[PDB]
Amino acid sequence: NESVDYRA
């Protein structure tokens, strides 16, 4: 997750 927004 640390590399991609959760709304993306």
Side-chain angles (χ1 to χ4, degrees):
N1 307 302
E2 292 177 298
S3 64
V4 63
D5 196 84
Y6 78 90
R7 289 193 179 184

